[PDB]
Coordinates of all heavy atoms in Angstrom, one line a residue:
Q1064 N 1.9 -73.2 -0.1 CA 2.4 -74.2 0.9 C 2.3 -73.7 2.3 O 2.0 -74.4 3.2 CB 3.8 -74.7 0.5 CG 4.3 -75.9 1.4 CD 5.1 -75.4 2.6 OE1 5.4 -74.2 2.8 NE2 5.3 -76.4 3.5
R1065 N 2.7 -72.4 2.5 CA 2.7 -71.8 3.8 C 1.3 -71.4 4.2 O 1.1 -71.2 5.4 CB 3.6 -70.6 3.7 CG 5.1 -70.8 3.6 CD 5.7 -71.3 4.9 NE 7.2 -71.1 4.9 CZ 8.1 -72.0 4.4 NH1 7.7 -73.1 3.8 NH2 9.4 -71.7 4.5
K1066 N 0.4 -71.3 3.3 CA -1.0 -70.8 3.5 C -0.9 -69.3 4.0 O -1.8 -68.9 4.8 CB -1.8 -71.7 4.5 CG -2.1 -73.1 4.0 CD -3.2 -73.7 4.9 CE -3.4 -75.2 4.5 NZ -4.4 -75.8 5.3
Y1067 N 0.0 -68.6 3.5 CA 0.1 -67.2 3.8 C -0.9 -66.4 3.0 O -1.3 -66.8 1.9 CB 1.5 -66.6 3.4 CG 2.7 -67.1 4.3 CD1 4.0 -67.0 3.8 CD2 2.5 -67.5 5.6 CE1 5.1 -67.3 4.5 CE2 3.6 -67.9 6.3 CZ 4.9 -67.8 5.8 OH 6.0 -68.1 6.5
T1068 N -1.3 -65.3 3.5 CA -2.0 -64.3 2.7 C -1.2 -63.1 2.7 O -1.1 -62.3 3.6 CB -3.4 -63.9 3.3 OG1 -4.2 -65.1 3.4 CG2 -4.1 -62.9 2.4
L1069 N -0.5 -62.8 1.5 CA 0.4 -61.7 1.4 C -0.2 -60.6 0.5 O -0.5 -60.9 -0.6 CB 1.8 -62.2 0.8 CG 2.5 -63.3 1.5 CD1 3.9 -63.5 0.9 CD2 2.6 -63.1 3.0
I1070 N -0.3 -59.4 1.1 CA -0.8 -58.3 0.4 C 0.3 -57.3 0.2 O 1.5 -57.5 0.7 CB -2.0 -57.7 1.1 CG1 -1.6 -57.2 2.5 CG2 -3.1 -58.7 1.2 CD1 -2.7 -56.5 3.3
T1071 N 0.1 -56.2 -0.6 CA 1.1 -55.2 -0.8 C 1.2 -54.3 0.4 O 0.3 -54.2 1.3 CB 0.8 -54.3 -2.0 OG1 -0.4 -53.6 -1.7 CG2 0.5 -55.2 -3.3
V1072 N 2.4 -53.7 0.6 CA 2.6 -52.7 1.6 C 1.5 -51.7 1.6 O 1.0 -51.3 2.6 CB 4.0 -52.1 1.5 CG1 4.2 -51.1 2.6 CG2 5.1 -53.2 1.7
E1073 N 1.1 -51.2 0.4 CA 0.1 -50.2 0.3 C -1.3 -50.6 0.7 O -2.0 -49.9 1.4 CB 0.1 -49.6 -1.2 CG 1.4 -49.0 -1.6 CD 2.6 -50.0 -1.9 OE1 2.3 -51.2 -2.1 OE2 3.8 -49.6 -1.9
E1074 N -1.6 -51.9 0.4 CA -2.9 -52.4 0.8 C -3.0 -52.5 2.3 O -4.0 -52.2 3.0 CB -3.2 -53.8 0.1 CG -3.6 -53.6 -1.3 CD -3.4 -54.9 -2.2 OE1 -2.8 -55.9 -1.7 OE2 -3.8 -54.9 -3.3
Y1075 N -1.8 -52.9 2.9 CA -1.7 -53.1 4.3 C -2.0 -51.7 5.0 O -2.7 -51.6 6.0 CB -0.3 -53.6 4.6 CG -0.2 -54.5 5.9 CD1 0.2 -55.8 5.7 CD2 -0.3 -54.0 7.1 CE1 0.4 -56.6 6.9 CE2 -0.1 -54.8 8.3 CZ 0.2 -56.1 8.1 OH 0.4 -56.9 9.2
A1076 N -1.3 -50.7 4.5 CA -1.5 -49.4 5.1 C -2.9 -48.9 5.0 O -3.4 -48.2 5.9 CB -0.5 -48.4 4.5
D1077 N -3.5 -49.2 3.9 CA -4.9 -48.9 3.7 C -5.9 -49.5 4.7 O -6.8 -48.9 5.1 CB -5.4 -49.2 2.2 CG -4.8 -48.2 1.2 OD1 -4.2 -47.2 1.6 OD2 -5.0 -48.5 0.0
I1078 N -5.6 -50.8 5.1 CA -6.3 -51.4 6.1 C -6.2 -50.6 7.4 O -7.2 -50.4 8.1 CB -5.9 -52.9 6.4 CG1 -6.3 -53.7 5.1 CG2 -6.6 -53.4 7.6 CD1 -5.7 -55.1 5.2
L1079 N -5.0 -50.2 7.8 CA -4.9 -49.5 9.1 C -5.7 -48.2 9.0 O -6.3 -47.8 10.0 CB -3.4 -49.2 9.3 CG -2.6 -50.5 9.5 CD1 -1.1 -50.2 9.7 CD2 -3.1 -51.4 10.6
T1080 N -5.6 -47.5 7.9 CA -6.3 -46.2 7.7 C -7.8 -46.5 7.8 O -8.5 -45.7 8.5 CB -5.9 -45.6 6.4 OG1 -4.5 -45.3 6.4 CG2 -6.7 -44.3 6.1
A1081 N -8.3 -47.5 7.2 CA -9.7 -47.9 7.3 C -10.2 -48.2 8.7 O -11.4 -48.0 9.0 CB -10.0 -49.0 6.3
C1082 N -9.3 -48.7 9.5 CA -9.6 -49.0 10.9 C -9.5 -47.8 11.8 O -9.6 -47.9 13.0 CB -8.6 -50.1 11.4 SG -9.0 -51.8 10.7
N1083 N -9.2 -46.6 11.2 CA -9.2 -45.4 11.9 C -7.9 -45.1 12.6 O -7.9 -44.1 13.4 CB -10.4 -45.4 12.9 CG -10.9 -44.0 13.0 OD1 -10.9 -43.2 12.1 ND2 -11.5 -43.7 14.2
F1084 N -6.9 -45.8 12.4 CA -5.6 -45.4 12.9 C -5.1 -44.1 12.4 O -5.4 -43.7 11.2 CB -4.5 -46.5 12.7 CG -4.7 -47.7 13.6 CD1 -5.5 -48.8 13.1 CD2 -4.2 -47.8 14.9 CE1 -5.7 -49.9 13.9 CE2 -4.4 -48.9 15.7 CZ -5.1 -50.0 15.2
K1085 N -4.3 -43.4 13.2 CA -3.8 -42.1 12.8 C -2.3 -42.2 12.6 O -1.7 -43.1 13.1 CB -4.1 -41.1 13.9 CG -5.6 -40.9 14.2 CD -6.3 -40.3 13.0 CE -7.8 -40.0 13.3 NZ -8.6 -41.2 13.4
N1086 N -1.8 -41.2 11.9 CA -0.3 -41.1 11.7 C 0.2 -42.4 11.2 O 1.3 -42.9 11.6 CB 0.4 -40.7 13.0 CG -0.2 -39.4 13.6 OD1 -0.1 -38.4 13.0 ND2 -0.8 -39.5 14.8
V1087 N -0.5 -43.0 10.3 CA 0.0 -44.3 9.7 C 1.2 -44.1 8.9 O 1.3 -43.3 7.9 CB -1.1 -44.9 8.8 CG1 -0.6 -46.2 8.2 CG2 -2.4 -45.2 9.7
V1088 N 2.3 -44.7 9.3 CA 3.6 -44.7 8.6 C 3.8 -46.1 8.1 O 3.8 -47.1 8.9 CB 4.7 -44.3 9.5 CG1 6.1 -44.5 8.8 CG2 4.5 -42.8 9.9
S1089 N 4.1 -46.3 6.8 CA 4.5 -47.5 6.3 C 5.8 -47.4 5.6 O 6.1 -46.4 5.0 CB 3.5 -48.1 5.3 OG 3.3 -47.3 4.2
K1090 N 6.7 -48.4 5.8 CA 8.0 -48.4 5.2 C 8.2 -49.8 4.5 O 8.0 -50.8 5.1 CB 9.1 -48.3 6.2 CG 9.0 -47.0 7.1 CD 10.1 -47.0 8.2 CE 9.9 -45.9 9.2 NZ 10.4 -44.6 8.6
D1091 N 8.6 -49.7 3.2 CA 9.0 -50.9 2.5 C 10.5 -51.1 2.9 O 11.4 -50.4 2.4 CB 8.9 -50.7 1.0 CG 9.2 -52.0 0.2 OD1 9.9 -52.9 0.8 OD2 8.8 -52.1 -0.9
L1092 N 10.7 -52.1 3.8 CA 12.0 -52.3 4.3 C 12.6 -53.6 3.7 O 13.4 -54.3 4.3 CB 12.0 -52.5 5.9 CG 11.6 -51.3 6.7 CD1 11.8 -51.6 8.2 CD2 12.5 -50.1 6.3
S1093 N 12.3 -53.8 2.4 CA 12.8 -55.0 1.7 C 14.3 -55.0 1.6 O 14.9 -56.1 1.7 CB 12.1 -55.1 0.3 OG 10.7 -55.3 0.4
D1094 N 14.9 -53.9 1.4 CA 16.4 -53.8 1.3 C 17.1 -54.2 2.6 O 18.1 -54.9 2.6 CB 16.9 -52.4 0.8 CG 16.5 -52.1 -0.6 OD1 16.3 -53.1 -1.4 OD2 16.5 -50.9 -1.0
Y1095 N 16.5 -53.7 3.7 CA 17.0 -54.0 5.0 C 16.8 -55.5 5.3 O 17.6 -56.2 5.8 CB 16.4 -53.1 6.1 CG 16.8 -53.5 7.5 CD1 18.1 -53.6 7.9 CD2 15.8 -53.6 8.5 CE1 18.4 -53.9 9.2 CE2 16.1 -53.8 9.8 CZ 17.5 -54.0 10.2 OH 17.8 -54.3 11.5
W1096 N 15.6 -56.0 4.9 CA 15.3 -57.4 5.1 C 16.3 -58.3 4.3 O 16.8 -59.3 4.9 CB 13.9 -57.7 4.6 CG 13.3 -59.0 5.0 CD1 13.2 -59.5 6.3 CD2 12.7 -60.0 4.1 NE1 12.7 -60.8 6.2 CE2 12.3 -61.1 4.9 CE3 12.5 -60.0 2.8 CZ2 11.7 -62.2 4.4 CZ3 11.9 -61.2 2.2 CH2 11.6 -62.2 3.0
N1097 N 16.6 -57.9 3.1 CA 17.6 -58.6 2.3 C 19.0 -58.6 3.0 O 19.7 -59.6 3.0 CB 17.7 -57.9 1.0 CG 18.7 -58.6 0.0 OD1 19.9 -58.4 0.1 ND2 18.1 -59.5 -0.8
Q1098 N 19.3 -57.5 3.7 CA 20.6 -57.5 4.5 C 20.5 -58.5 5.6 O 21.5 -59.2 5.9 CB 20.9 -56.1 5.0 CG 21.3 -55.1 3.9 CD 21.6 -53.7 4.4 OE1 20.9 -53.3 5.4 NE2 22.5 -53.0 3.8
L1099 N 19.4 -58.5 6.3 CA 19.2 -59.4 7.5 C 19.3 -60.9 7.0 O 19.9 -61.7 7.6 CB 17.9 -59.2 8.1 CG 17.6 -57.9 8.8 CD1 16.2 -57.8 9.2 CD2 18.6 -57.7 10.0
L1100 N 18.7 -61.2 5.9 CA 18.7 -62.5 5.3 C 20.1 -62.9 4.9 O 20.5 -64.1 5.1 CB 17.8 -62.6 4.0 CG 16.3 -62.5 4.3 CD1 15.6 -62.1 3.0 CD2 15.7 -63.8 4.8
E1101 N 20.9 -62.0 4.4 CA 22.3 -62.3 4.0 C 23.2 -62.6 5.2 O 24.0 -63.5 5.2 CB 22.9 -61.2 3.2 CG 22.4 -61.1 1.8 CD 23.0 -62.1 0.8 OE1 23.6 -63.0 1.3 OE2 22.9 -61.9 -0.4
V1102 N 23.0 -61.9 6.3 CA 23.7 -62.1 7.6 C 23.3 -63.5 8.1 O 24.2 -64.3 8.4 CB 23.4 -61.1 8.7 CG1 23.9 -61.5 10.0 CG2 23.9 -59.7 8.3

């Protein structure tokens, strides 16, 4: 319904690496996101 394209955190980081970015840091912040949603 949203027409989103949702990929995994790992796939997303792999795209950045493939684009030649350095020091790629990815964090799964789902727990923090859940806290924000609850507030």
Side-chain angles (χ1 to χ4, degrees):
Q1064 186 271 348
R1065 290 284 199 276
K1066 294 192 188 179
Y1067 290 161
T1068 300
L1069 305 190
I1070 59 177
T1071 65
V1072 177
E1073 298 75 19
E1074 283 159 354
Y1075 209 115
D1077 286 352
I1078 294 170
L1079 300 180
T1080 297
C1082 288
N1083 215 27
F1084 286 93
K1085 299 300 185 285
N1086 305 297
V1087 177
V1088 170
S1089 63
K1090 303 173 187 285
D1091 184 339
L1092 296 184
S1093 298
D1094 290 338
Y1095 177 49
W1096 192 55
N1097 183 278
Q1098 291 180 325
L1099 295 171
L1100 290 160
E1101 286 281 14
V1102 170

